[PDB]
Amino acid sequence: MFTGIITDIGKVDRVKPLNEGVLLRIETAYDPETIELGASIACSGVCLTVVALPEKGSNARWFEVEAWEEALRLTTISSWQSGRKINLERSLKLGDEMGGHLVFGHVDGQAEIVERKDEGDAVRFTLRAPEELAPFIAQKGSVALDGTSLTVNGVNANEFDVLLIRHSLEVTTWGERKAGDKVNIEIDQLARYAARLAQY
Amino acid sequence: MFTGIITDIGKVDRVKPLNEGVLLRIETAYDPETIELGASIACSGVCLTVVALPNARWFEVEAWEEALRLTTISSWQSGRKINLERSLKLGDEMGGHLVFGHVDGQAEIVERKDEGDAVRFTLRAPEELAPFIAQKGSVALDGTSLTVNGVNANEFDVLLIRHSLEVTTWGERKAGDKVNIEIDQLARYAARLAQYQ
Amino acid sequence: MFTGIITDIGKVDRVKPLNEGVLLRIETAYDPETIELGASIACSGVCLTVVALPEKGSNARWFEVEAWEEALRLTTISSWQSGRKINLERSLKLGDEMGGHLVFGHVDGQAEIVERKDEGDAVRFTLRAPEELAPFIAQKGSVALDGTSLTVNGVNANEFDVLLIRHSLEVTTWGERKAGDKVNIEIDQLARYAARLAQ
Numbered sequence A: 001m002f003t004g005i006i007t008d009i010g011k012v013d014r015v016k017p018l019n020e021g022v023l024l025r026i027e028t029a030y031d032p033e034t035i036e037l038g039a040s041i042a043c044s045g046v047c048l049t050v051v052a053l054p055e056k057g058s059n060a061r062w063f064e065v066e067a068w069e070e071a072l073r074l075t076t077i078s079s080w081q082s083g084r085k086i087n088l089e090r091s092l093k094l095g096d097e098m099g100g101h102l103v104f105g106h107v108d109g110q111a112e113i114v115e116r117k118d119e120g121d122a123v124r125f126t127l128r129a130p131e132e133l134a135p136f137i138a139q140k141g142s143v144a145l146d147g148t149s150l151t152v153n154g155v156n157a158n159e160f161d162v163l164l165i166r167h168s169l170e171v172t173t174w175g176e177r178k179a180g181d182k183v184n185i186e187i188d189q190l191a192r193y194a195a196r197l198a199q200y
Numbered sequence B: 001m002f003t004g005i006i007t008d009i010g011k012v013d014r015v016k017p018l019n020e021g022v023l024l025r026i027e028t029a030y031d032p033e034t035i036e037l038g039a040s041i042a043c044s045g046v047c048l049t050v051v052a053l054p055n056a057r058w059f060e061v062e063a064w065e066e067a068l069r070l071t072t073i074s075s076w077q078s079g080r081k082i083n084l085e086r087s088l089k090l091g092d093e094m095g096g097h098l099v100f101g102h103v104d105g106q107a108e109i110v111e112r113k114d115e116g117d118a119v120r121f122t123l124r125a126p127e128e129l130a131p132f133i134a135q136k137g138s139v140a141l142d143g144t145s146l147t148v149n150g151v152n153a154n155e156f157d158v159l160l161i162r163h164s165l166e167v168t169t170w171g172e173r174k175a176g177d178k179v180n181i182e183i184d185q186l187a188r189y190a191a192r193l194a195q196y197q
Numbered sequence C: 001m002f003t004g005i006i007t008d009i010g011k012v013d014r015v016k017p018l019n020e021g022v023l024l025r026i027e028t029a030y031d032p033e034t035i036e037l038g039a040s041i042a043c044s045g046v047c048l049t050v051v052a053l054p055e056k057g058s059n060a061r062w063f064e065v066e067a068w069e070e071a072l073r074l075t076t077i078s079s080w081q082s083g084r085k086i087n088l089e090r091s092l093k094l095g096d097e098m099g100g101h102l103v104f105g106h107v108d109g110q111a112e113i114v115e116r117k118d119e120g121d122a123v124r125f126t127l128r129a130p131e132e133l134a135p136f137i138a139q140k141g142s143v144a145l146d147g148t149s150l151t152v153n154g155v156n157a158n159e160f161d162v163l164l165i166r167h168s169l170e171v172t173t174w175g176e177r178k179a180g181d182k183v184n185i186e187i188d189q190l191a192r193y194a195a196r197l198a199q
């Protein structure tokens, strides 16, 4: 589990073809001596499992994950090539506060940035989502976009706004985001369960 | 508490009947020196208390009435492989979701489909547990933290990644097999808020 | 941080009014040599900072803590007089086992015991939760009551049930608890999260 507070911008260094999947080697600022095999790392919102790390005597910092059909088809990972910059977050540890918005890394789908506008040193992103996700995108609600926890600023039908502050633009991949880009979206877990209850 | 990330495949070595319960000796890769009496270990999702310990690597647990009735443990015999997870220690990563090891019942695998080196399992849960199973929500099946990828009534599908197929008992699971299901406790919190309102 | 496994039953030795607070001296079975000034100890669920220990040469076993406006208002501490027995738990370190659940020692309020019923192996305590906390107390969830890690066995409107096993009655202050008694309540992490999103 995660909070949607991005702590590193990883870079996809190597892409290798697997049997209906891909092997991703992701360069990171994280110390590999703090990562265990089988650990969960959120990669632009997608929870992925570490399968390989550098040898103990290596100076290089990276981790390897394997993305399979579900992650490939639903998330932006299908378009990830060598050089791609991604948001990274380590898993919450027992003892850590849960905060105001839990992110689990099971991405619901994708939203498209349809407009990008500067507002001082901040940037307003207008996005469109699939109809199915619209009931979950609510005013003042929290949502994870590319693994980044963000407040829904304005909403118009299937379109909604998020306001990204200068700091968030610097430490995440959001600074390079352009109109037309796809981002991973994860709705709130509590709202998800509340809605599933309501249909009964 | 647990997180649904399996760290060992244990083997049931001894099964001894008791008064309204069973005694189980599980062979494990866990170091007995790291285990104390009274410790909680999730055995294929079922939270059981260690009652007996030994260089030999094993622990003993007792499954009572509720556990034997609700879970797959009633079918556990010598030779059976089970998923194992240690209780979270302070500072341990909660890589899945919050898993408590109170199994709500049994789910039956209705379909196993190969997806390259990953495997899609379609399962059928009890009707009572269906409202707690949401699309792209979490579930613990045989103690494994998994995303519900699609849901249709009481039927749902999960995808088992290569790594998990290697380090868990899921690699040998087939259609017809029953698994332990713990619904997300967070879904129970949602139900409580809806009940109050 | 704490887990809700009580390791000593302390006795409130003295209570002294302070400027906007109260000083408490608590008699303990803990070795004062293993306690440092500034250490966190859960006192019937309430996380408190050690402000004083016995002097050099002294063989006495006590520690002093100070309770401020929030602790005095929200918790049972305002009622603590000399002789009062309280649950004690030491703060855990990185890598320590967590046999209860995650307990921060930030008490949310007071729950009142309404019923105590002996059921052989365990004693069933029925409690009334504060109105604000009740919607976030759910079956199978964990609760810290007087710092004791307990499972919510069932919920009935503003009331809920907990089961206390014989060992817990022996090692905690729950052995002397009766109907009408107010206990400290801290809801677990999922409950706290649900309470945060609703408010």
Ligand SMILES: Cc1cc2nc3c(=O)[nH]c(=O)nc-3n(C[C@H](O)[C@H](O)[C@H](O)CO)c2cc1N(C)C
Binding pocket: A003, A004, A005, A006, A007, A099, A100, A101, A142, A147, A148, A149, A150, A151, A152, A162, A163, A164, A165, A167, A168, A169, A171, A172
């Ligand atoms: C609930 C919540 C909402 C947030 N909303 C926003 C937001 O609307 N805009 C923004 O630039 N940054 C945000 N943030 C902060 C960003 O998530 C972080 O700055 C980035 O992940 C980089 O660490 C929010 C954080 C939150 N936490 C408490 C879970």
Ligand SMILES: Cc1cc2nc3c(=O)[nH]c(=O)nc-3n(C[C@H](O)[C@H](O)[C@H](O)CO)c2cc1N(C)C
Binding pocket: A001, A040, A045, A046, A047, A048, A049, A050, A065, A066, A067, A068, A069, A070, A071, A072, A074, A075, A104, A105, A106, A107, A108, B095, B096, B097, B136, B145, B146, B147, B161
């Ligand atoms: C703990 C955890 C680990 C996961 N590891 C992987 C993984 O290693 N490869 C993969 O393709 N998909 C994974 N997934 C599933 C992907 O995150 C989802 O398929 C995408 O987010 C799309 O929903 C994992 C999920 C997990 N839980 C927490 C949600």
Ligand SMILES: Cc1cc2nc3c(=O)[nH]c(=O)nc-3n(C[C@H](O)[C@H](O)[C@H](O)CO)c2cc1N(C)C
Binding pocket: B040, B045, B046, B047, B048, B049, B050, B061, B062, B063, B064, B065, B066, B067, B068, B070, B071, B100, B101, B102, B103, B104, C151
């Ligand atoms: C900490 C803990 C220890 C438990 N130990 C045992 C146990 O030792 N034997 C047993 O039959 N059932 C147990 N249980 C209850 C079993 O996990 C449940 O009966 C089964 O999962 C079926 O719901 C324990 C439960 C616990 N928490 C989660 C409340």
Ligand SMILES: Cc1cc2nc3c(=O)[nH]c(=O)nc-3n(C[C@H](O)[C@H](O)[C@H](O)CO)c2cc1N(C)C
Binding pocket: C040, C045, C046, C047, C048, C049, C050, C065, C066, C067, C068, C069, C070, C071, C072, C074, C075, C104, C105, C106, C107, C108
């Ligand atoms: C590390 C820590 C130390 C604390 N020390 C004290 C303290 O020394 N006195 C006090 O009145 N309240 C305290 N508090 C706050 C009290 O525990 C809360 O006011 C009560 O539990 C009521 O919420 C401390 C809290 C702490 N963390 C866990 C949050």
